[PDB]
Amino acid sequence: STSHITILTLNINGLNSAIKRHRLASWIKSQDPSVCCIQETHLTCRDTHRLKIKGWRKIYQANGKQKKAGVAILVSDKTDFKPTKIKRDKEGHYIMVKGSIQQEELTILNIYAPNTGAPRFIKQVLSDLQRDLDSHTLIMGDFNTPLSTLDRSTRQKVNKDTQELNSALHQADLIDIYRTLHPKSTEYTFFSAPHHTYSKIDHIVGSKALLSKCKRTEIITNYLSDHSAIKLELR
Ligand SMILES: [Mn+2]
C-alpha cells in the first residue's frame, strides 16, 4: 500500500567512527527512507569504502582529501534506482545524482555549502550545473544560510547574496518546498550558542513541477548531530 518515495537530508557531523556509523545505520533503518542525503561525512577520498549501511548498499560519495566536508547519497536496497549521471565536487561539498525510479526521472543535488560565503557558493554550483537542472530536480542539504526571514529566530531580512541566490533559483523554476508546504513555519534545524539564535539552514528546494507530488515534509530532531534532519514524502 506504499509507492511513495521518501528522501531525507541530514548533516551528520562526521562518520569516521565505526560506532557512529552503526548509530546512523540504526537511525536510517528506523526512518526507512528511499533516498538519503548526508552531509559532513568527513571521509577522505581514500576512506569512502568504509561507509557501509545495512540495507542501503547503493552509495554515491563526493569527498575531499581531508577529514572535512564529504557528502553521500544513499539509496535503499528496496528502491530500484537506475542512475544515468553522477557528478562529484572535487572538494566534497556537493554531489548530483541523476536517474530514474519506476520510470520517473529524478535529479538530486546534495549540497554542503561552507559557513562563509554560502549563498554565493550555492549560486555558483547552480551555474556550474545549469545544464543538468530540470523540472524533476531536488536540491537538499546544509545551505548554511536562511532563504527567507522566518528561517531565523532573529527574523532578520536576508542579505543581498541570499537575494541573488533566490533570483537564480527562480530562474531555474526552483522553490523552497518546505516553506511552500508550511509558509508560516517557525521551525529550526540548527542552534548557534554564541548568539543564542535558532535557524533553519538545512533546506529542501525543488522544481515547481514537483510541488503536486510532495505529500508531506517535516523536521526530525535526533541525538546524532548538531543538525536536525528534514524528510520529504514524494508521489
Ligand atoms: Mn560539523
* DSSP codes joined into one string, 28-46: HHHH--SEEEEE-----TT
State the distance from the centre of ligand 1 to the C-alpha of 11, rounded, in angstroms: 8
Query: CA-to-CA distance for 75 and 41, rounded, in angstroms?
Result: 16
- CA–centroid distance, residue 141 to ligand 1 (Å): 13
Q: Is 196 exposed, middle or buried (0-12, 13-18, 19+ CB in 10 A)?
A: exposed
Return the half-sphere exposure (C-beta side, CA atoms, 13 A cut-off) of residue 60: 24
For residues 85 and 107, the answer to whether their CB atoms sit within 8 Å is: no
Cα-to-chain-centroid distance, residue 223? 19
User: 5-234 has which CATH code?
Assistant: 3.60.10.10
CA of 4 to the centre of ligand 1 (A): 31
d(CA 192, ligand 1 centre) in Å: 12
Question: Measured in angstroms, how far is the CA atom of residue 226 from the centroid of ligand 1?
Answer: 7
Centre of ligand 1 from the C-alpha of residue 230, in Å: 17
3-state helix, strand, coil split of the chain in percent (to 5) is 25, 35, 40
Give the integer Cα–Cα distance in Å for 162 and 84: 32
Contact 6, 232 (CB under 8 A): yes
Q: How far is the CA of 14 from the centre of ligand 1 (A)?
A: 7
**Residue 46: exposure state from Cβ atoms within 10 A (0-12, 13-18, ≥19):** exposed
Distance 201 CA to ligand 1 centre (A): 13
What the block records as the C-alpha cell of 52 is: 557501509
Q: Given in angstroms, what resolution was this structure solved at? A: 2.2
- H/E run at residue 176: strand 174-176
Question: If you measure from the C-alpha of residue 153 to the centroid of ligand 1, how many angstroms do you get, rounded to a whole number?
Answer: 21
Distance between Cα 167 and ligand 1 center (Å): 28
Q: Please state the three-class secondary structure of 69-128 as a single string.
A: CCEEEEECCCCCEEEEEEEECCCCCEEEEEEEECCEEEEEEEEECCCCCHHHHHHHHHHH
165 grid coordinates: 541566490
Compute the distance from residue 52 Cα to the ligand 1 centre, in Å: 20
Separation of alpha carbons 194 and 126, rounded Å:
31
Calculate Rg over the CA atoms of the chain: 16
Residue 76 CA from chain centroid, whole number: 16
- In the reported structure, the alpha carbon of residue 217 is separated from the centroid of ligand 1 by a whole-number distance in angstroms of 24
Contact 154, 197 (CB under 8 A): yes
| CA dist., res. 143 & res. 133, Å (int) | 17
Q: Which residues contact 214 (CB under 8 A, 6 or more apart)?
A: 177, 181, 206, 232, 233, 234, 235
Report every protein residue that has its C-beta within 5 angstroms of ion ligand 1.
Answer: 13, 40
Q: Distance between CA 9 and CA 37 in Å, rounded? A: 5
Amino acid in the structure at residue 57: R
* Residue of 80, 77, 143 whose CA lies nearest to 106: 80
